[model samples]
Target: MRIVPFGAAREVTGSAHLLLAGGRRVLLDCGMFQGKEEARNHAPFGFDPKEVDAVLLTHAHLDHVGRLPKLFREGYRGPVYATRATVLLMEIVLEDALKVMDEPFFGPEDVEEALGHLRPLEYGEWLRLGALSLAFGQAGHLPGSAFVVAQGEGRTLVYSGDLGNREKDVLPDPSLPPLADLVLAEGTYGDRPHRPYRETVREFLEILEKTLSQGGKVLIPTFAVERAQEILYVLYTHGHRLPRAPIYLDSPMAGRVLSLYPRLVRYFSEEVQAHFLQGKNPFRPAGLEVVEHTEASKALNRAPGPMVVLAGSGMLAGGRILHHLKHGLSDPRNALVFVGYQPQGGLGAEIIARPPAVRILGEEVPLRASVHTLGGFQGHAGQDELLDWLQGEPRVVLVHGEEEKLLALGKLLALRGQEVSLARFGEGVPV
Candidate 1:
């Protein structure tokens, strides 16, 4: 058997891996490259799309499944397998991606064609195609997120799409295969530990309380998927402890995704399900307002201070958050809070760097707003948690991190006498 990394070998975004086994070609993921390297999403896929016999998805994050439509447009007609919730969420992710990109790699027709071939599988259900036996297991990262196990030619491979925090309250801890001959792992947070969730929640509330008490508006830039919903959940559980303030859900896509939580309750964590069973809405606050129209979103700029505004494009890369920043970032009374991972070289990182001024919407705006980060809200597992998820000393290959973090993990794992390799983009290795 051979494994080849098509993307995200030593990088933080764009996760694709190719495997050749049992006389068949299988693609692990077809994610799009993001941030500074996003232009690479339009480059040739290195391997021919027509040669892939099947595609297995780990989750619906744009970095993991964003390139499927381009593959479809390039003549791949194979089935794509994922959990039911992932399939539903993929529709939303793809649609949002199309809207965000200026020169899109694929269109609505391409997305539709790709969606037509999605085959949803329940957790633990075995799927046999050609010479591969594949199954999905719970990955606590996001709704319907999963890690994959593949077996062929008497060898087993476990691929962690993106492992979630073991202490995650909204999703179950990742359930991984007990053993595998080869393991393709993610090292997104390999360099450090996240703040404890409880501590982070307290930090969020304290920041909100301090800001609102000073008649300041809190601008929270979040991703439309898990981060947005998770923030709402956090607010629902703890908002009452803080002063009374309006909570605005400003992204249309986020509002739509939030509406999906009830229908997909079975996939949620036990705590979330308990809320549903108890007839309590964890996503809705008494002062919650869903902003959908362009005019309504614009009106938020002129609205009163002391309210919390949740807008999308988590990294401050794009979407409604930019507009909010343009209107509110210049005031010393306002605060900008980040609750998700901020990619390096993205606008979020620039802003967090505390530059004297940041260029937004073709204008240079002075940076006067208070900035804070809630690192505990991160969805990915840290180095220790990633180590805990590893089973049976498999031949491990680390991906999905910057070079420094990947090297650190490699050295740490090597010190434990386990064989480990740090993959480079387009590199291939025999298993």
Candidate 2:
């Protein structure tokens, strides 16, 4: 058997891996290049799309599933297997991606064609896709996020597609797969452990309280898919404790994702389950408002402070968050809380670096608002949690991180007497 990484080998975004076994050319994920890697999207996929016999999706994150439309555009009509939740959320993700990109590689028609081939593959269920026996299990990264296991030719392979931190109470603990000969893993945070989740939550609330109490605005540049909903749940649980302030969810796409949570109650953690079972609305704070139109979103700029605004494009690459930052940054009374990872060289990363001034909306603005990054809100597992999820040491190939992170994980696993390698883009690693 042989496996090749088409993208995101030693990078933080774009996660595509191709597996060759049992005469079947199965693609693990057709993720798109993002941020610094955006230019790669214009180039041809290293492997021919027409030759891929089947496609398996891990989640709805743009980095993991962004190129599905492009796959369809390139003449791949094979069935794409994903969890039911992934299918619903992916539609939103793809559409948002198309809307965000100035020169989208795939058109709206392409997205529709790709989405048409999606077939739901529930967790623990098995399927025979040509020569491979494939199964998906929860990865705890997002609502329908998964890690895949495939067996063929007398060998089993487990592919970790962005594993999650179990400490995050919103999602359940990641699945422990049947022992396999080899595992393809993500090492996004493999260099260190995340700050204690409870402590992170405390830090988040302190920022909210301090900002709101002083009649300052708190801006959260949220990742629309899972983080927006997660922040809503956090606000709901701590509604009474927080200062009396209005909460504005400014991204329409995030609102679309928010609407899906009602049906996905069973897929979440016990606490989330309890909220649903008790017939309580777990995501709506008392003063929550969904901004649906440009005029309404524009009105938010003129709106008074002591309000919490959650906007999209978590990395500040694009979307409604930039407009919010234009106004929020100039005010010393406002606070910007980053709840997701900021890709290097992006506006989010640049602002968090505390530049005295930043260029936004074609104008320069003073950076006076206090900036804070809360890591506890992240969905990806840290080094210790990734190790825990791996259980006993297993032969591993790492992806979905920078060179340092992959090497850190590889060195640690090697010290433990386990064979480990870092996957390189377009390089076929024989198993």
Candidate 1 off by > 4 Å: 355-357
Q: 1-431 in candidate 1: lDDT tens per residue?
A: 77898888889778989988888888988899987788998899999999999898888899999999999999999999888888899989899889878779999999999999999888989988777788888888878988888888888888888999877588877885558887888998888877898888888888899999988899999888888888888888886787888899998999988888887788888888999999988988768898998898888888878899999777776778899999899999999999878877878889989999999999999999999988888899988888778745657899999888988877778887778998877888776
Query: What lDDT does the true structure give each of the candidates?
Result: 0.87, 0.88
Please give the lDDT score at residue 389 for candidate 2: 74
Error of 1 at 10 (Å): 1.2
Extract clashing residue pairs from model 1: none
Candidate no. 1 TM-score: 0.95
Determine which window of 10 residues in candidate 2 has minimal summed lDDT.
386-395
Number of clashing residue pairs, candidate 1: 0
The best candidate by lDDT is: 2
